Design a protein around this ligand. Structure first.
Ligand code: HEM
Ligand code: HEM
Lengths: 191, 191
């Protein structure tokens, strides 16, 4: 159904476990309250996903040095690559809100890190593109990912107090994930 | 005056330049509007720094796996290390708000990265402590650094609209810096 999407079936145990996740949740101040509100964020965002994708890919597409990461060697955007990734990105919005953050979730977080990194970039879709996404931009993107989501959370007729709690949960969850995705980028033993 | 604080006098040119910084600012959505409001954040936070430090170090100190990074080999917090770092952290609050983000600023961002990493950790204060701060926690800390600051920004009798703009500027600036600090942690050529 979603080409290349292998959540829960990588058959590869990540190099981090639930104890690692507990300590990382503590560092990012994520608790059971955020679990509640991230789920509620999923209810709000579910039927706005197409517009979210348009916004997100609009941001990427308007910056040549960002759109770069989806380009063919000739410098033009690879439209097959963009379309296939867009489907998996859309699903990630739902996963972030709806999935339990358990070992299967960690195993896919390792996978997503590997796919941004040179280790696995451009293999899932069998495309020819740039070899690596510089780690600096994964961290930077914590901000726009959070900023893209804010207006959409405010839209579904929920209380502003609930909106703030959903937004903070989303900020924490995005930060948590990017922290895990540093694994293949970071010198062994420094993560 | 501040022991170990060597901003603007490292005499070492960072491996990133103003073009790198321009592209990273674009990725984190930082503009001249944020320059304005981060400066205004500095006016607000200046006379609350002691309370900010208490909050921040309170968070670190209440989590044994975080306080770990300041511990002597015997597992007890090194109080000399805590005190010396606290002075440089306090100054960093002001620097973030007040400094122009120019080459000198980049050169100190490289330095701060090096000091969290095993490359330079525990050398500035000539202490014996744990060798490295795992990069996962630098990313994670983007959230509490931003969450610690929010209440203080809301305190100095400014409009809530200005408060929101100061807070967003602070979020962007913190993310920007952590992205740069990945440099010594990231495999060469993957940053
Ligand atoms: C907060 C930061 C980021 C988030 C949340 C994010 C999210 C995602 C997701 C969910 C996927 C699909 C994962 C899967 O295969 O199931 C993906 C892949 C991809 N992302 Fe990101 N991403 C981030 C940073 C970046 C940056 C900075 C770029 C640069 C434009 C980028 C470009 C791409 C590309 C090119 C792929 C395809 C990688 C491949 O060949 O498999 N991502 N991203
Ligand atoms: C957003 C993330 C972080 C920020 C903004 C931050 C800020 C700072 C600053 C401003 C300094 C002093 C720099 C200087 O020497 O002038 C410092 C040093 C230090 N920080 Fe962080 N820090 C972050 C992440 C962390 C984490 C996750 C830990 C773990 C507890 C930590 C523990 C320390 C320690 C132990 C030092 C002393 C390093 C040395 O030996 O030189 N920091 N930090």
């Amino acid at each position: 159904k979603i080409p290349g999407y292998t959540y829960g079936e990588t058959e590869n145990r990540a190099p981090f476990n639930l104890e690692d996740l507990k300590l990382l949740k503590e560092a990012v101040m994520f608790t059971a309250e955020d679990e509640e509100y991230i789920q509620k964020a999923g209810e709000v965002l579910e039927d706005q996903v197409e517009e979210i994708l348009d916004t997100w890919y609009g941001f990427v597409g308007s910056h040549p040095h960002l759109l770069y990461y989806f380009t063919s060697p000739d410098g033009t955007p690879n439209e097959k690559y963009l379309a296939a990734v867009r489907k998996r990105f859309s699903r990630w919005i739902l996963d972030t809100s709806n999935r339990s953050y358990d070992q299967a979730w960690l195993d896919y977080q390792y996978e997503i890190g590997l796919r941004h990194h040179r280790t696995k970039k451009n293999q899932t879709d069998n495309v020819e593109s740039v070899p690596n996404i510089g780690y600096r931009y994964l961290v930077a993107f914590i901000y726009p990912i959070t900023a893209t989501m804010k207006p959409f959370l405010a839209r579904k007729g929920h209380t502003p107090e609930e909106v703030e709690k959903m937004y903070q949960a989303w900020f924490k969850a995005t930060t948590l994930q990017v922290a895990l995705w540093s694994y293949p980028y970071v010198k062994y033993g420094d993560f």
